[PDB]
């Protein structure tokens, strides 16, 4: 059961490169692609993310996309840069200028067919393809515009497969341009229609965690990417190691998505580490309380402001399964109002013996109605500019029409009202 990984744009390639470095270490794969691990329980499901090449080499089933060579040249030089298939680097020369329209309609449309040729080649060499996972940001131009363009084209060619994304939401606290609410709203509109599951990784939440919790006053993208790669590792553990719960993308979607449009997940992680941090190993009760706390959410939403439709918890490392079950049952009994009563047993728990890194950790995946706070924040920012048609010339100049913006704004407002409807049920 193979997954085809695609990473697009600066953010998509930076978080994507970290994800591959992290899991390559976990699976005992070195930068040359050779296996040198101390367990085989690393190679049991290695084929989910890696292909097997000539001299017993494991090659990531990853496709690196960007309209600018810069970020991809940085990857090719980084630690695990040589692990990727050289043919799978697909890049243009004229970037996207943080413009969704350029990535989706003009610059991106010129490069998209060559990317699909690589996607097709990777798919044809799959015994049984489960689907695709895309890493990207929604505030830029390549990952946002060209990424959603790729999703649309892939869906047309593989309508019966799962489309999963790790989508980095933009925030004024960690911003590159004022047009981020435009790019994000346009991308969310695409995501609501063409993805089965999206992990909402909020830069606002990643910033507040680094600043308020870790006390990293003046955090860098590297600091935010430390949390991201750790969360990405946790949420994909069930797909990379032998397990019974959410072992593939489809079963995960069936367990987590009660309504087709409501597929935006709020990840959580514990303990919150800081690059090069100190000594203790968090008890099971401590892991559980933290992963459910607003301060550990990777989306800037207060779960106490909504209700959980479904939840998937994953514990990693050697620990008491009896204690895990007691702690998991306790969080629900102590906060039963924040879990919808009309979805019985909506909190599932998995445990993996192999820890990340750390001695023991816990990853949370929640489909909460509080996620509307993220879409409300973006919608507010989008409307503040769209109301006065600010910066629209950059988009209309690429061929886009104002009607397209009105539809994206409306679809996202509908998404918010749908999340609110199920919160009042």
């Amino acid at each position: 059961r193979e997954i085809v990984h695609i990473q697009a744009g600066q953010c998509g390639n930076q978080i994507g490169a970290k994800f591959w470095e992290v899991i390559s270490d976990e699976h005992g794969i070195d930068p040359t692609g050779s296996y040198h691990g101390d367990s085989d329980l690393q190679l049991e499901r290695i084929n989910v993310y890696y292909n097997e090449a000539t001299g017993n080499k494991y090659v990531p089933r990853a496709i690196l996309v960007d309209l600018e060579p810069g970020t991809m040249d940085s990857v090719r030089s980084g630690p695990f840069g040589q692990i990727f298939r050289p043919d799978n680097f697909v890049f243009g020369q004229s970037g996207a200028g943080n413009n969704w329209a350029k990535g989706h309609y003009t610059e991106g449309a010129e490069l998209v067919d060559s990317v699909l040729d690589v996607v097709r080649k990777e798919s044809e060499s799959c015994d049984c393809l489960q689907g695709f996972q895309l890493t990207h940001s929604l505030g830029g131009g390549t990952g946002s515009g060209m990424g959603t363009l790729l999703i649309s084209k892939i869906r047309e060619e593989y309508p019966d497969r799962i489309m999963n994304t790790f989508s980095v939401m933009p925030s004024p606290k960690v911003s590159d341009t004022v047009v981020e609410p435009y790019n994000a709203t346009l991308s969310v509109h695409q995501l609501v229609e063409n993805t089965d599951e999206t992990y909402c990784i909020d830069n606002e939440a990643l910033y507040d965690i680094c600043f308020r919790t870790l006390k990293l006053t003046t955090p860098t993208y590297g600091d935010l990417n430390h949390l991201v790669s750790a969360t990405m590792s946790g949420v994909t553990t069930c797909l990379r190691f032998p397990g019974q719960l959410n072992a593939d993308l489809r079963k995960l979607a069936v367990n987590m998505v009660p309504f087709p449009r409501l597929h935006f997940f709020m990840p959580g992680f514990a303990p919150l580490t800081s690059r090069g941090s100190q000594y203790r190993a968090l008890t099971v009760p401590e892991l559980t309380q933290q992963m459910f706390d607003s301060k550990n959410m990777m989306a800037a939403c207060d779960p106490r402001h909504g209700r959980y439709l479904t939840v998937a918890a994953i514990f990693r490392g050697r620990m008491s399964m009896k204690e895990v079950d007691e702690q998991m049952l306790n969080v629900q009994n102590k906060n039963s109002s924040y879990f919808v009563e009309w979805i019985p047993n909506n909190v599932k728990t998995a445990v993996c013996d192999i820890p990340p890194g750390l001695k023991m950790s816990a990853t949370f995946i929640g489909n909460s109605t509080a996620i509307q706070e993220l879409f409300k924040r973006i919608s507010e920012q989008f409307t503040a500019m769209f109301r006065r048609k600010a910066f629209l010339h950059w988009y209309t100049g690429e061929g886009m029409d104002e009607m397209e913006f009105t539809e994206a704004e409306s679809n996202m407002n509908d998404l918010v009202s749908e999340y609110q409807q199920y919160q009042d049920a």
Binding site: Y105, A109, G399
Partner: protein, 70 residues
């Protein structure tokens, strides 16, 4: 959706090409109309000066008439 994707890029081409077209024609019209205006200003100026020479020839002739009828 593919249909709209093609309509967007073609709309962008049709607008830039049409803008380049109009600018080219308006610039050529301005440079031409300017050439006509400047040349007209010089033509009228020379016409005024020529009318002044025609008047000097008529003065020299008007003296020729008075000298003979003296």
């Amino acid at each position: 959706k593919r249909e709209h994707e093609r309509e967007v890029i073609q709309k962008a081409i049709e607008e830039n090409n049409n803008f380049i077209k109009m600018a080219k024609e308006k610039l050529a019209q301005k440079m031409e109309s300017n050439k006509e205006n400047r040349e007209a200003h010089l033509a009228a100026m020379l016409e005024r000066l020529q009318e002044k020479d025609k008047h000097a020839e008529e003065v020299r002739k008007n003296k020729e008439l008075k000298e003979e009828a003296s």
